[PDB]
């Protein structure tokens, strides 16, 4: 479906502050998880996006089963990688996902697909591709975005603040964009504060990594500055 078509129904005519907006503060972000030693961030990113939509559009706090996507998503390759859109297409084809209480995550351990391990399931109606130049807008009115990114070995040493490591060569990981912010950093020479912009991102390396699971990555007031090729792939699940 058209991004422009859908955006009209959610934006209206009003403008918006391009400096800051954080879904963690607007009932739009569920708890960080851990993909562990398994190339399955494509599942965490996607499921994550759906959990958000449920929290936002329906005030329902539900956490869903990545293990199921790992087991049951036949377009993707489980612990060995996958694609975000393949993940959504598979959610639709399966008629929704079990809650992770019913279908826990067991990473790389041999597990069989079994889509009747829960009675109630949560699905999406469709999904949407976001233009690399409408990230903040899509964030503001549509919610958190499942995106691709290019990570180097430096991300593993990231602890706090705005990321200042090398970027990656090629897209290779999935994460969630959950907002944007700006902090003023005082200029040594000037002793004046200076505005700095960043995207706020949800990773799946558990909560001992980064800012309790999240990382801040440099952007600009417009959100066109896309470090680490972030947002090259970008999708939002629609549940309504």
């Amino acid at each position: 479906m058209n991004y422009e078509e859908v955006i009209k129904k959610y934006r209206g005519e009003e403008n918006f502050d391009h400096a800051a907006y954080d879904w963690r503060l607007h009932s739009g972000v569920t708890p960080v998880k851990d993909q562990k030693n398994c190339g399955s961030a494509w599942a965490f990113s996607s499921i994550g996006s759906v959990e958000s939509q449920y929290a936002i559009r329906k005030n329902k706090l539900i956490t869903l089963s990545e293990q199921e996507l790992v087991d049951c998503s036949f377009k993707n390759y489980g612990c060995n990688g996958g694609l975000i859109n393949n993940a959504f297409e598979d959610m639709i084809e399966l008629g929704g996902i079990c809650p992770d209480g019913d279908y826990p995550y067991v990473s790389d351990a041999p597990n069989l697909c079994n889509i009747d391990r829960c009675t109630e399931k949560y699905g999406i109606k469709n999904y949407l591709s976001v233009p690399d130049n409408k990230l903040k807008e899509a964030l503001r009115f549509l919610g958190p975005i499942s995106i691709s990114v290019a990570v180097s070995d430096d991300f593993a040493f990231y602890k706090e603040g705005i990321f200042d490591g090398e970027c990656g060569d090629q897209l290779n990981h999935a994460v969630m964009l959950v907002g944007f912010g700006m902090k003023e950093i005082v200029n040594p020479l000037t002793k004046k504060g200076e505005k700095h912009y960043y995207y706020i991102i949800k990773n799946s390396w558990g909560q001992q990594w980064g800012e309790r699971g999240f990382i801040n990555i440099e952007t600009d007031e417009s959100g066109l500055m896309r470090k680490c090729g972030l947002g090259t792939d970008a999708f939002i699940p629609l549940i309504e």
Binding site: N37, C38, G39, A41, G81, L83, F157, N172, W205
Partner: protein, 129 residues
């Protein structure tokens, strides 16, 4: 030169020694396999004459930049090599003997922010002859 590719990654913390015979001067290629975007990286942790006792509790939480260069031996820190996200991640280390001997070369795939969580350690037992 002559080469060696490791190695089946598990979710439980483990060790794997693997012996390799080498003629002096001969160059040995270690091909290190993993998964992109998990937060694990391969780090060259040490060269020992003593059989090394492995404790992940004591691995570096920070970046380990120095490669290993001595009169007897030289070994390098592993380095690099719709897209597939989270696919196989190749990294390469270089081993070169300069003097006959026995050497314990230690590599590990671990998370700096959680070293005990499923560290896969590879000891190469190399003989320079």
């Amino acid at each position: 030169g002559k080469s060696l590719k490791l190695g089946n990654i598990s979710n439980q913390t483990n060790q794997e020694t693997i012996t390799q015979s080498l003629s002096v001067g001969e160059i040995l290629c270690i091909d290190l396999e993993g998964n992109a975007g998990t937060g694990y990286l391969w780090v060259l942790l040490g060269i020992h004459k003593d059989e090394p006792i492995i404790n992940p509790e004591n691995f570096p939480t920070k970046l380990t930049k120095k490669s290993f260069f001595s009169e007897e031996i030289s070994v390098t820190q592993p380095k690099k090599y719709m897209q597939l996200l989270g696919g196989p991640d190749r990294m390469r280390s270089v081993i070169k003997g300069h003097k006959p001997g026995k050497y314990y070369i230690v590599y590990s795939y671990y998370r700096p922010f959680s070293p005990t969580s499923g560290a896969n350690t590879k000891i190469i037992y190399v003989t320079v002859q």
